[PDB]
């Protein structure tokens, strides 16, 4: 045990001697309080520590203890359904031990419960040669998720003793004979947040993620392992879209990270997220969710290291073979904390008052998400899908952190305050939003349901883009002075907007639309446009079509409420549309 002595305290900077055993980027306990600190510079036995908490009441001569490791995160049973801060302190257990509603400094508590008894069911066989990532057992941590115990990195040997019993995350559960000798393993492993978990191979995501949201899954889809950037303007309902993705997406675990936020906004997340209900199990969504909560008053390092802690946890479940979805809110407030940390280091100011490595730190984040081949002899696959939210002051999207984020990610769901004022929910601008996975997803879609889905999405978007050009002409001349082909296009686009793009997240049936339900819903709309246009070229006036198609159009309008086991009611619309249209031209 080596202890250093403080020789200087100047604001957030504390220098201590007798730190020869410590290394750069190691965590420390500064002073009698032991406030958390990180070694930035080290010359001989004298290290320069950046203290994260308040240094008031700390002077020279006080002891400094190095943890012997960088900023890490405990990964074991007890991590799910827990709310941590940026440095992964358990806010739930912290409040009980402190017995106060506030955060005292110097209070050091383990991230996980090192005293809870977990039943470890061993799946491995003795004598098996195991490497990093090999699964030796599992723990039923929650009713939804089965926590799988895997061999940590750097361990490589033959299993000598394995037993099934109730142990803590500290009790040795397995003995492995490495080339150096015997080594014990527990259900919990530590990992530095600033280092990516090793993988066998990285694969590009070509499988679309089913969010059940029609505007997203159809026009601007995200893939399991892709990244989507969502800008949050007040009143656009970003919280609703974030909730719908957290509960309806076909992902095993959801990681929510709060870099910085108003105390009332962060409180909204802490209250509303546990009330979300997993559709399949019916249990609370927290049974498969790890939450991280920070605020502006909390230390900047906790705010800056928030996204690195949450993505390391997502990587941990990714190596087990799970599909994880990580959401950060907000990356802009994370970048602000990054710039404040840069100011404490007297670093040179880059473009627009941001560190010159702002794009690098963002690239290092999104390059850790994606579909990978995890370690272990199983060669199992896992993915991490990033759904980051950008909050720009004034709403300008040209701000540095958004343009650097958009340079890496391929999906962008432009939320619009003007759409929310028109009761258009989800308030996603269909002209400004885009997805670079639309081509690959379209190929995947055409293959799985054996239909020309890709040609339908392009036409539906072409109709929406044609509506925008017609509205400019409408504003100048009027709605009445338009061809019936133009009048039909406006009503077809109005159908795509109201009957497809708009869905209520609170409606029991409309909250989720399956892939096959999305197909038949978009087909009957496009089929109406084709049969109406074809008859319009046969001498039928636009008013004549709308007159005798009131009953069918209403059935198309209410197709979003048809249950999943009644899709035959949405498939028979096409036959009714065809018979009605040809009946009109016959008269």
């Amino acid at each position: 045990m080596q202890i250093g002595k403080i020789i200087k305290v100047s604001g957030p900077l504390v220098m201590a001697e007798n730190m020869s055993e410590a290394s750069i980027q190691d965590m420390c306990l500064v002073g009698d309080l032991g406030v958390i600190g990180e070694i930035i510079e080290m010359r001989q036995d004298v290290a320069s520590i950046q203290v994260y908490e308040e240094t008031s009441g700390i002077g020279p001569g006080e002891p400094v203890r190095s943890t012997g490791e960088a900023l890490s995160v405990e990964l074991g049973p007890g991590i799910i359904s827990q709310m941590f801060d940026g440095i992964q302190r358990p806010l739930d257990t912290f409040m009980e031990v402190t017995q106060s509603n506030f955060l005292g400094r110097g209070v050091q508590l383990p991230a996980l419960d090192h005293e809870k008894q977990w039943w470890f069911e061993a799946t491995i066989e003795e004598g098996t040669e195991v490497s990093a990532g090999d699964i030796i057992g599992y723990v039923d941590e929650t009713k939804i998720i089965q926590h799988k115990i895997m061999v940590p990195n750097g361990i490589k040997g033959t299993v000598q003793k394995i037993e099934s019993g109730s142990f803590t995350i500290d009790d040795p559960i397995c003995v492995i004979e490495t080339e150096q000798g015997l080594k014990e393993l527990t259900m919990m492993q530590k990992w530095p947040v600033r280092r990516g978990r090793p993988i066998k191979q990285k694969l590009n995501p070509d499988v679309p993620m089913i969010t059940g949201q029609r505007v997203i899954d159809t026009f601007f889809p995200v893939t399991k392992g892709g990244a989507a950037a969502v800008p949050g303007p007040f009143g656009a309902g970003k919280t609703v879209v974030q909730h719908q993705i957290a509960k309806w997406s076909d992902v095993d675990l959801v990681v929510y990270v709060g870099c910085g936020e108003r105390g009332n906004e962060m409180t909204d997340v802490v209250n509303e997220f546990p009330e979300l209900i997993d559709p399949n199990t019916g249990e609370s969504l927290m049974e498969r969710t790890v939450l991280i909560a920070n605020t502006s008053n909390m230390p900047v390092a906790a705010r800056e290291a928030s996204i690195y802690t949450g993505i390391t946890i997502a990587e941990y479940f990714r190596d087990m073979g799970y599909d994880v979805a990580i959401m950060a809110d907000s990356t802009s407030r994370w970048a602000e904390a990054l710039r404040e940390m840069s100011g404490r280091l007297e670093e040179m100011p880059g473009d627009e008052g941001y560190p010159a490595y702002l794009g690098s730190r963002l690239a290092e984040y999104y390059e850790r998400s994606g579909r990978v081949i995890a370690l272990g002899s199983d060669q199992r696959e896992g993915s991490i899908t990033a759904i980051s939210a950008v909050s720009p002051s004034g709403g300008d999207i040209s701000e540095p952190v958004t343009q650097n984020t958009l340079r890496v990610v391929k999906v962008f769901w432009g939320l619009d305050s003007s759409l929310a004022q028109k009761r258009h929910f989800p308030s996603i601008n269909w002209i400004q939003s885009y997805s670079l996975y639309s081509t690959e997803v379209g190929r995947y879609m055409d293959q799985i349901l054996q239909q020309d889905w890709s040609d339908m999405v392009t036409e539906g978007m072409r109709i929406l883009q044609e509506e925008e050009q017609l509205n400019e002409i409408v504003r100048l001349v009027g709605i009445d002075s338009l061809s019936d082909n133009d009048r039909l296009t406006l009503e077809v686009a109005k159908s795509i907007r109201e009957d497809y793009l708009q869905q209520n997240a609170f409606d029991d049936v409309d909250t989720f639309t399956s892939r096959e339900k999305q197909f038949n819903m978009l087909k009957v709309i496009l089929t109406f446009g084709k049969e109406a246009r074809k008859a319009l070229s046969l001498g039928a006036y636009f008013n004549e079509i709308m007159e005798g198609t009131v009953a069918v159009r209403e059935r198309i309008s209410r197709s979003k409420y048809i249950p999943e086991e009644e899709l035959a009611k949405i498939s028979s619309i096409n036959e009714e549309i065809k018979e009605t249209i040809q009946l009109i031209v016959s008269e």
Binding site: S10, L103, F234, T267, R333, E346
Partner: protein, 454 residues
């Protein structure tokens, strides 16, 4: 405590003390000079046996050889007590008024502690400020951080004084209090507050921290932390609804750059320190409700926008920590509108939490959007009238134009000494909606028109 007679260097407001031990960071000191003058100070840096201190009153007239330094052994503290209500203190908490000094129940650091995110509670109940522009269109909520943006020379001191007099919670089982923190204001503004608070009896419900403009820059920075410490004490320990009002917050930022320039630190945007966003967040985030506790802290920071610019760093960074803003325009003040509150650029992010039946009447949100949309077309027709005369305005364009005129002189302009209840504000909103024909009122539901519309 022992005196230290070793002063090696005196460079500006800083001072070097040597051969000391047991000295901590940010602890207070007392300097005894040859004359015997006493001057407070704070340790800014300490290494080995050396120690760097900063004197508040200044460094003029100090001889290093024949002076001494006393280390009190404690940082900046505030003697909190339930007897502070009805008393006026200086920047650091000394009895500014000629009253009996309070017996402190305890001493607390002005920095405080961070609120546990899982322990903080959501804002729910509605605070009646008595002002129609802040009760109806931009509602105030318990635990909300809703600031006021003003200009230099605009009546923001009368507005802050009015809210401190009229703020109330519509529940009986509660204790309401106001923590009024004057920050670097002139004597004439300080005399206006202290005289008005005793004239209307609002001082019996207030705790005032008056910090003048000629006071040292350190006290200007400590004044918010001082008042916020007494605010959290009355709300979280004594269970009271505390409303915090800060003026002027621009003076607080002007004191940071003055300190940052003395510390030779690198400036950020517009010369302000790079940590201005965080130093302000340290103050504005010390509010809200806590689970299981009846008390709450609500903050209304008043700041003057330099050059009347919203893109300025001081008003911009405040918008990233607060939940809205109340804009004061000179154009309304030129027309005698009191308070000159422009409802178009003002906003309350949490207004939906304290409206509706049970917190207000059922027509709060409906008339809010109708009045807002009607006042928009009114000022749009007024601005369109100057460009192409009054001839181009249609019938409804002349009706909305007369609506915008009456909406300013009869609804917004209420007077700094008129405390409208929430029912009077809603009933008055329906009286102005009576100018417009029933066909224009599309957002209001037909059932509401048949019940309240005159």
């Amino acid at each position: 405590i022992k005196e230290y007679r070793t002063i090696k260097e005196v460079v500006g407001p800083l001072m070097a003390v040597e051969k000391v031990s047991g000295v901590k960071y940010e602890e207070l000191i007392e300097v005894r000079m040859q004359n015997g003058e006493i001057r407070r100070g704070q340790v800014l840096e300490v290494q080995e046996d050396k120690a760097m201190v900063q004197i508040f009153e200044g460094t003029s007239g100090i001889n290093y050889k024949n002076s001494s330094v006393r280390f009190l052994g404690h940082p900046l503290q505030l003697g909190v007590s339930e007897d502070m209500i009805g008393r006026v203190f200086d920047g650091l908490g000394r009895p500014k008024d000629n009253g009996p000094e309070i017996l402190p129940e305890k001493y607390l650091d002005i920095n405080g502690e961070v609120i546990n995110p899982i322990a903080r509670d959501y804002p729910d109940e509605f605070i009646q400020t008595g002002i129609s522009a802040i009760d109806h269109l931009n509602t105030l909520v318990r635990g909300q951080k809703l600031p006021v943006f003003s200009g230099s020379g605009l009546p923001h001191k009368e507005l802050a004084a009015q809210i401190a007099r009229q703020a109330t919670v519509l529940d009986s089982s509660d204790d309401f209090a106001v923590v009024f923190a004057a920050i670097g204001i002139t004597f004439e503004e300080a005399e206006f507050f202290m005289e008005d608070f005793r004239q209307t009896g609002a001082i019996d419900r207030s705790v005032m921290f008056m910090n003048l403009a000629n006071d040292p820059a350190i006290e200007r920075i400590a004044t918010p932390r001082m008042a916020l410490t007494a605010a959290e004490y009355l709300a979280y320990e004594k269970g009271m609804h505390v409303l915090v009002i800060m003026t002027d917050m621009t003076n607080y930022a002007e004191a940071l750059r003055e300190i940052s320039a003395a510390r030779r630190e690198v400036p950020g945007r517009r010369g302000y320190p790079g940590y201005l966003y965080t130093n302000l967040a340290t103050l504005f985030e010390r509010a809200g409700r806590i689970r299981g506790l009846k008390g709450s802290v609500t903050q209304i920071p008043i700041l003057t926008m330099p050059e009347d610019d919203k893109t300025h760093p001081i008003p911009d960074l405040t918008g990233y920590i607060t939940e809205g803003q109340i804009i004061l325009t000179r154009e309304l003040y030129k027309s005698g509108i009191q308070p000159p509150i422009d409802v178009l650029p003002s906003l309350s992010r949490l207004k939906d939490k304290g409206t509706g039946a049970g917190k207000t009447r059922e027509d709060h949100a409906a008339t809010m959007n109708q009045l807002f949309a009607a006042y928009a077309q009114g000022k749009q027709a007024k601005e369109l009238a100057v460009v192409l005369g009054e001839s181009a305005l249609s019938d409804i364009d002349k009706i909305y134009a007369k609506f915008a005129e009456r909406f300013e002189n009869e609804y917004v302009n209420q007077g700094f000494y008129t405390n409208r209840t929430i029912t009077e504000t809603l009933d008055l909103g329906w009286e102005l909606l009576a100018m417009l024909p029933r066909t224009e009122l599309k957002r209001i539901k037909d059932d509401l028109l048949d019940k309240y519309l005159p």
